[PDB]
Amino acid sequence: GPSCVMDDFRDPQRWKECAKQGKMPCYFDLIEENVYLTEMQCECTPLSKDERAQGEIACGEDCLNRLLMIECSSRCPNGDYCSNRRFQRKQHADVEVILTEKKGWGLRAAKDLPSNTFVLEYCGEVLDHKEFKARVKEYARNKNIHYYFMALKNDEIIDATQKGNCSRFMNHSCEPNCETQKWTVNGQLRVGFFTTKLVPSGSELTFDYQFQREAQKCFCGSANCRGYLGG
Numbered sequence: 001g002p003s004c005v006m007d008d009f010r011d012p013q014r015w016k017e018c019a020k021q022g023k024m025p026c027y028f029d030l031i032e033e034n035v036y037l038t039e040m041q042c043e044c045t046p047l048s049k050d051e052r053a054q055g056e057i058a059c060g061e062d063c064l065n066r067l068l069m070i071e072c073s074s075r076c077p078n079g080d081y082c083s084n085r086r087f088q089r090k091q092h093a094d095v096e097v098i099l100t101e102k103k104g105w106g107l108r109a110a111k112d113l114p115s116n117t118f119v120l121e122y123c124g125e126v127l128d129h130k131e132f133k134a135r136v137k138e139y140a141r142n143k144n145i146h147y148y149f150m151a152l153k154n155d156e157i158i159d160a161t162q163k164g165n166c167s168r169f170m171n172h173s174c175e176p177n178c179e180t181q182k183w184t185v186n187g188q189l190r191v192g193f194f195t196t197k198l199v200p201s202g203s204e205l206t207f208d209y210q211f212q213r214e215a216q217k218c219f220c221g222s223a224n225c226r227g228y229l230g231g
């Protein structure tokens with residue numbers, strides 16, 4: 001019933017207004033890139049203008065970068081035509097945040113999304129496994145229902161609880177239709193959601209949310225459903 005679009009979140013005044021009549025999620029800090037505490041060229045042959053004209057893919061599936069899960073930079077053999085800079089160009093799919101029967105807010109496809117399609121970056125604060133643990137107990141002491149945690153690399157856990165983006169409304173499903181993929185962008189590892197199937201317009205977007213220890217009941221609906229979240 002109550003949905004909103006990506007751009008609803010860029011006005012804090014308007015949003016906190018919609019927050020008070022439950023037509024938008026609880027407020028948080030919207031970010032495009034990741035917060036921290038401190039922290040090599042493509043090899044495809046160029047396409048012509050003749051080949052740009054029929055829309056044939058620049059740095060498509062045969063690209064040494066793409067295949068190592070490393071995004072091109074500005075100085076790539078296809079430059080602007082290069083299609084393997086999806087993170088940097090924020091080439092996100094069309095998604096609305098929706099309200100789910102029992103899961104809190106969720107994410108649905110506003111159009112048909114083909115398989116292996118960049119949905120969004122999971123952005124947030126990047127913590128070392130000390131900070132993260134302090135935070136887990138801080139949040140358990142706060143009795144926060146929801147949990148916005150994810151491992152990135154050894155001693156690097158991304159926490160969207162306070163600061164983050166609409167990727168954090170992605171819900172679990174024991175039979176999902178997206179997966180995480182870890183990508184390098186200027187030698188900084190980044191993590192985005194990518195579709196694993198042909199999600200129809202209107203359908204909820206879901207992944208296999210894996211995490212440590214009150215194990216939460218799972219309402220994914222799916223047949224052959226674990227029954228609880230975790231691992």
Ligand SMILES: Nc1ncnc2c1ncn2[C@@H]1O[C@H](C[C@@H](CC[C@H]([NH3+])C(=O)O)[NH2+]Cc2ccccc2)[C@@H](O)[C@H]1O
Nearest residue numbers: 103104105146147148149168169170171172218219220
């Ligand atoms: N099948 C399900 N049954 C029951 N509860 C479910 C559920 N799937 C999701 N939940 C609820 O979601 C919380 C986490 C969610 C917030 C989304 C929530 N809807 C909200 O409104 O904030 N983030 C996940 C995440 C983490 C890191 C990167 C990306 C995503 C859970 O702790 C659970 O409460």
Ligand SMILES: [Zn+2]
Nearest residue numbers: 042044059063
């Ligand atoms: Zn290439």
Ligand SMILES: [Zn+2]
Nearest residue numbers: 059072076082
């Ligand atoms: Zn390229």
Ligand SMILES: [Zn+2]
Nearest residue numbers: 174218220225
């Ligand atoms: Zn389930």
